[PDB]
Scaffold this active site. Sequence first.
Site, mmCIF file in Angstrom:
data_model
loop_
_atom_site.group_PDB
_atom_site.id
_atom_site.type_symbol
_atom_site.label_atom_id
_atom_site.label_comp_id
_atom_site.label_asym_id
_atom_site.label_seq_id
_atom_site.Cartn_x
_atom_site.Cartn_y
_atom_site.Cartn_z
ATOM 1 N N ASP A 1 -2.263 -28.437 95.626
ATOM 2 C CA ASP A 1 -2.375 -28.675 97.042
ATOM 3 C C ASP A 1 -2.771 -27.435 97.816
ATOM 4 O OD1 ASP A 1 -2.226 -29.536 99.581
ATOM 5 O OD2 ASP A 1 -0.159 -30.252 99.453
ATOM 6 N N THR A 2 -4.065 -27.295 98.102
ATOM 7 C CA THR A 2 -4.549 -26.076 98.753
ATOM 8 C C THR A 2 -4.117 -25.996 100.221
ATOM 9 O OG1 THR A 2 -6.693 -27.119 99.260
ATOM 10 C CG2 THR A 2 -6.512 -25.890 97.187
ATOM 11 N N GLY A 3 -3.661 -27.113 100.784
ATOM 12 C CA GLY A 3 -3.184 -27.119 102.155
ATOM 13 C C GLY A 3 -1.705 -26.772 102.252
HETATM 14 C C1 LIG Z 1 -0.010 -31.016 106.463
HETATM 15 C C2 LIG Z 1 -0.459 -29.792 105.672
HETATM 16 C C3 LIG Z 1 -0.904 -28.716 106.651
HETATM 17 C C4 LIG Z 1 0.673 -29.238 104.762
HETATM 18 N N1 LIG Z 1 1.248 -30.099 103.676
HETATM 19 C C5 LIG Z 1 0.404 -30.049 102.435
HETATM 20 C C6 LIG Z 1 -0.486 -31.337 102.333
HETATM 21 O O1 LIG Z 1 -1.406 -31.244 101.297
HETATM 22 C C7 LIG Z 1 0.370 -32.660 102.161
HETATM 23 C C8 LIG Z 1 1.020 -32.840 100.773
HETATM 24 C C9 LIG Z 1 1.665 -34.268 100.742
HETATM 25 C C10 LIG Z 1 1.052 -35.404 100.147
HETATM 26 C C11 LIG Z 1 1.651 -36.698 100.180
HETATM 27 F F1 LIG Z 1 1.061 -37.749 99.589
HETATM 28 C C12 LIG Z 1 2.894 -36.834 100.863
HETATM 29 C C13 LIG Z 1 3.531 -35.729 101.497
HETATM 30 F F2 LIG Z 1 4.690 -35.862 102.146
HETATM 31 C C14 LIG Z 1 2.885 -34.468 101.428
HETATM 32 N N2 LIG Z 1 -0.453 -33.887 102.467
HETATM 33 C C15 LIG Z 1 -0.112 -34.872 103.430
HETATM 34 O O2 LIG Z 1 0.821 -34.756 104.218
HETATM 35 O O3 LIG Z 1 -0.909 -36.025 103.453
HETATM 36 C C16 LIG Z 1 -0.536 -37.229 104.134
HETATM 37 C C17 LIG Z 1 -1.557 -37.646 105.224
HETATM 38 C C18 LIG Z 1 -2.943 -37.197 104.862
HETATM 39 O O4 LIG Z 1 -3.680 -38.300 104.054
HETATM 40 C C19 LIG Z 1 -2.852 -39.037 103.059
HETATM 41 O O5 LIG Z 1 -2.517 -38.309 101.897
HETATM 42 C C20 LIG Z 1 -1.125 -38.027 101.825
HETATM 43 C C21 LIG Z 1 -0.541 -38.412 103.155
HETATM 44 C C22 LIG Z 1 -1.534 -39.401 103.729
HETATM 45 C C23 LIG Z 1 -1.677 -39.136 105.184
HETATM 46 S S1 LIG Z 1 2.967 -30.322 103.493
HETATM 47 O O6 LIG Z 1 3.237 -31.218 102.392
HETATM 48 O O7 LIG Z 1 3.533 -30.751 104.744
HETATM 49 C C24 LIG Z 1 3.533 -28.607 103.103
HETATM 50 C C25 LIG Z 1 3.526 -28.044 101.787
HETATM 51 C C26 LIG Z 1 3.950 -26.725 101.591
HETATM 52 C C27 LIG Z 1 4.371 -25.938 102.720
HETATM 53 N N3 LIG Z 1 4.837 -24.576 102.703
HETATM 54 C C28 LIG Z 1 5.189 -24.042 103.898
HETATM 55 N N4 LIG Z 1 5.674 -22.743 104.148
HETATM 56 C C29 LIG Z 1 5.887 -22.029 105.439
HETATM 57 C C30 LIG Z 1 6.433 -22.658 106.632
HETATM 58 C C31 LIG Z 1 4.747 -21.899 106.353
HETATM 59 S S2 LIG Z 1 4.948 -25.315 105.215
HETATM 60 C C32 LIG Z 1 4.368 -26.495 104.017
HETATM 61 C C33 LIG Z 1 3.944 -27.810 104.182
#
Ligand SMILES: CC(C)CN(C[C@@H](O)[C@H](Cc1cc(F)cc(F)c1)NC(=O)O[C@H]1[C@H]2CO[C@H]3OC[C@@H]1[C@H]3C2)S(=O)(=O)c1ccc2nc(NC3CC3)sc2c1
Lengths: 99, 99
Positions: free
Chosen positions: B25-27
């Site tokens: 997860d690059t995000g």
């Molecule tokens: C929102 C991003 C900016 C950050 N995130 C990573 C994303 O890649 C997530 C991964 C994920 C996938 C899922 F399947 C379900 C989930 F719960 C999470 N993707 C997502 O939310 O996707 C959603 C929406 C997008 O489209 C579809 O796909 C999946 C669904 C759906 C609708 S994180 O998880 O919040 C994260 C990770 C590590 C971290 N480290 C931190 N450190 C310090 C305080 C700086 S803060 C921090 C935050």
Amino acid sequence: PQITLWQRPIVTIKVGGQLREALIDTGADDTIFEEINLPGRWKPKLIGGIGGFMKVRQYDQIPIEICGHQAIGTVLVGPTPINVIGRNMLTQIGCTLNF
Amino acid sequence: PQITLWQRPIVTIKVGGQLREALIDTGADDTIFEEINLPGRWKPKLIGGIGGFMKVRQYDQIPIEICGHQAIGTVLVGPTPINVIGRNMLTQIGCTLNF
Ligand SMILES: CC(C)CN(C[C@@H](O)[C@H](Cc1cc(F)cc(F)c1)NC(=O)O[C@H]1[C@H]2CO[C@H]3OC[C@@H]1[C@H]3C2)S(=O)(=O)c1ccc2nc(NC3CC3)sc2c1
């Protein structure tokens, strides 16, 4: 180009005639922007992430330019704290992971 | 390997003596797992994502094997919907984006 991960992989995009920055996000299925104004009809959608769900507007068949490459597809608009380019667009510009 | 994005980029990992699957997860800045059992002391942390905040346990200096590749670093444990490998680990295994 090649992008390493020592920093957040942020790129410049053009969408709906507007310029924004967004995170290349392989963990995102879909593409999500905050504070853009897209034309036309949309449908309400709920999406889930860390910490719960959020309400977004779903716009279909939206042209986007991502670091110079053209794509077209669904864009979600809602209160994300950072704009995210997800796999629905990344596949169109030939983005891969490598290690 | 090289990994395309037509499907979620899920890989097999070993952490704390346990086997799990996780999303490259690059995000994600940090690495987060649901339901693993790590030894030792930890500290409470609140992290933000789509839809709000969630409480996690922060474990430091945790060895992890990611698709056969060794790393060590911080691992967050909490109610994430899917296990995520973030940039703190991806940089150690030489992961890059390419397009
Ligand atoms: C929102 C991003 C900016 C950050 N995130 C990573 C994303 O890649 C997530 C991964 C994920 C996938 C899922 F399947 C379900 C989930 F719960 C999470 N993707 C997502 O939310 O996707 C959603 C929406 C997008 O489209 C579809 O796909 C999946 C669904 C759906 C609708 S994180 O998880 O919040 C994260 C990770 C590590 C971290 N480290 C931190 N450190 C310090 C305080 C700086 S803060 C921090 C935050």
